[PDB]
Amino acid sequence: GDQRFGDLVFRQLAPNVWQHTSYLDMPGFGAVASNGLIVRDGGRVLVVDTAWTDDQTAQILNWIKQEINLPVALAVVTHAHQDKMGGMDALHAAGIATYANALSNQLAPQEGMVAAQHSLTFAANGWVEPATAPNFGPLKVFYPGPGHTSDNITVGIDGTDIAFGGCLIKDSKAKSLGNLGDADTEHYAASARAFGAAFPKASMIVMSHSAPDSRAAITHTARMADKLR
Ligand SMILES: Cc1cc(C)c2c(CP(=O)(O)O)cc(=O)oc2c1
Ligand SMILES: [Zn+2]
Ligand SMILES: [Zn+2]
Numbered sequence: 001g002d003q004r005f006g007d008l009v010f011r012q013l014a015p016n017v018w019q020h021t022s023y024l025d026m027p028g029f030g031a032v033a034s035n036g037l038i039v040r041d042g043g044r045v046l047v048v049d050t051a052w053t054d055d056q057t058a059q060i061l062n063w064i065k066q067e068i069n070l071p072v073a074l075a076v077v078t079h080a081h082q083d084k085m086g087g088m089d090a091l092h093a094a095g096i097a098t099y100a101n102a103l104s105n106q107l108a109p110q111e112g113m114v115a116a117q118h119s120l121t122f123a124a125n126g127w128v129e130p131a132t133a134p135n136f137g138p139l140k141v142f143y144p145g146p147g148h149t150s151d152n153i154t155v156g157i158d159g160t161d162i163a164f165g166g167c168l169i170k171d172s173k174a175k176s177l178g179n180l181g182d183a184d185t186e187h188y189a190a191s192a193r194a195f196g197a198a199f200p201k202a203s204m205i206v207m208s209h210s211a212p213d214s215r216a217a218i219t220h221t222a223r224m225a226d227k228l229r
Helices: 054-067 088-093 102-107 188-198 216-226
Strands: 003-005 008-014 017-026 030-041 044-048 072-077 097-101 118-120 139-142 154-157 162-166 204-207
Touching (some): 003 054, 008 030, 008 054, 030 054, 030 154, 044 054, 054 088, 088 097, 097 102, 102 118, 162 216
Parallel strands (some): 162 204
Antiparallel strands (some): 003 008, 008 017, 017 030, 030 044, 139 154, 154 162
């Protein structure tokens, strides 16, 4: 099922949805996989998250050209860490419109990231303000509250059983919540549960560092985060 393409891996999850996977060495700790999504919406392609680097992100665009061969209309990135925004320059060099939480764009320079071109803003209840996410097609963007980071956002794919929790959600057998260096430990559990409640029909939960899982990824992540309080 997995397709090795250069140093990256691509996996079809639904007729119009693929997961992209890229790897970066964390010195002394190993090569860390990070996952994002690629969605075909009619005659265009939508991307969720870059790869770790510009070169890897250009390779995602190469794979899209060969395997889908439609223009990439936009990309949305889910927080201001390298695994999600490290390849912003490659998207801009390709002429792709880029979107991130306003807070992600504000944090980008201090995190060593390049900001996206456009800022998403969110209603008090977490749903993106639609005027800031034009032409997003089936992508439903939701801010669940602070968790893995204060700016983390999540994305559901309308017409599918798929929702993307990014680095907020860990798989149903995960032993830890990963990198908590920028985390909001007080609010993590509630933010994880809010993601689940925003996408109740999503039976396939896609996340940054594990293969897609059932909704037990959400319950287990929240249950682990209960211990942070
Ligand atoms: C200190 C630290 C920071 C980051 C950003 C990472 C990441 C990327 P993140 O998952 O937090 O978006 C992965 C990792 O394995 O370790 C880290 C350690
Ligand atoms: Zn992160
Ligand atoms: Zn992560």
